Write a protein that binds this ligand. Sequence first.
Ligand SMILES: C[C@@H](O)[C@H](N)C(=O)O
Ligand SMILES: C[C@@H](O)[C@H](N)C(=O)O
Lengths: 163, 164
Amino acid sequence: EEAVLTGVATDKSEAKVTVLGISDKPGEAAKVFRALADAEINIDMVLQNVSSVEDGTTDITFTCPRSDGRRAMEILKKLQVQGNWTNVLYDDQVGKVSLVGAGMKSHPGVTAEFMEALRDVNVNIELISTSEIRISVLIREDDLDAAARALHEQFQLEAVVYA
Amino acid sequence: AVLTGVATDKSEAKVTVLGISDKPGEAAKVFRALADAEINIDMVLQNVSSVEDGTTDITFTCPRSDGRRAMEILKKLQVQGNWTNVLYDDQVGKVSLVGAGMKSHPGVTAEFMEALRDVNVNIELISTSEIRISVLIREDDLDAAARALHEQFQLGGEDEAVVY
Ligand SMILES: C[C@@H](O)[C@H](N)C(=O)O
Ligand SMILES: C[C@@H](O)[C@H](N)C(=O)O
């Protein structure tokens, strides 16, 4: 019944790449990911939100090891010019911080307090993604310490019940 | 890479806050409002903000019966945040591929996308990690997507693990 938090994880070893302006039609994500998979880019997370109400296109962001970042840009910039994408952006100064746990679905206060914790130390949340075991956000790598510390304080974190 | 199953869910709605300012504290306003309303949040996805506008969008899923209410409780905050809007969709399906060791095998992500393309299913939202590739699609496309992924990854229906 309860949500249980088992840890706060930080990762400063990734880069994120964003492909902007993809038509929201079948097969467009396949074009991006077949190119990357053929180049052996080790993808950590992919995030694509719903397509825009003003343009109908959407953006796709993914993280990968920083050592894979320049190659992924090379592959994608080639694709960029052949098709109708707006642009491809690179960022190798991103940090990932995650609250790890279980049973968070029925406790929305866990999500609210994760955002409040980072707001209270002025850490801007650049990207959010979640799974069955984690709330993960991408922020400036220089804010990883303030962020992880704020989360440990917010949830009074070895494993803890959300209260 | 070892794949363990294809999971489907047709019990959720998705709600999207459009045009939120990309500055500290704004996601907290969204999520504190949903927590005080006791609305279960299943997945949250926010991509990067636009450099020209300084805004981004946040999408979350929740039980379908709470979707319209979640959208309307968030519309109470739209003006203060100068959001463009809050949308609700109760026709969404979620399909996921579960497995171990996907990070070192990007071919698994590419094949997931190819599978859906080859059955002409448009992917609305993507959220993946090393333990699960999840997408949101129209609920009427759920059966087609799910069968395509069983074929693509040679998975049966008994959760028998299959190496990639
Ligand atoms: C944008 C991309 O996800 C597209 N909707 C597809 O199905 O490939
Ligand atoms: C858009 C929202 O995530 C904002 N960047 C915040 O940190 O609250």
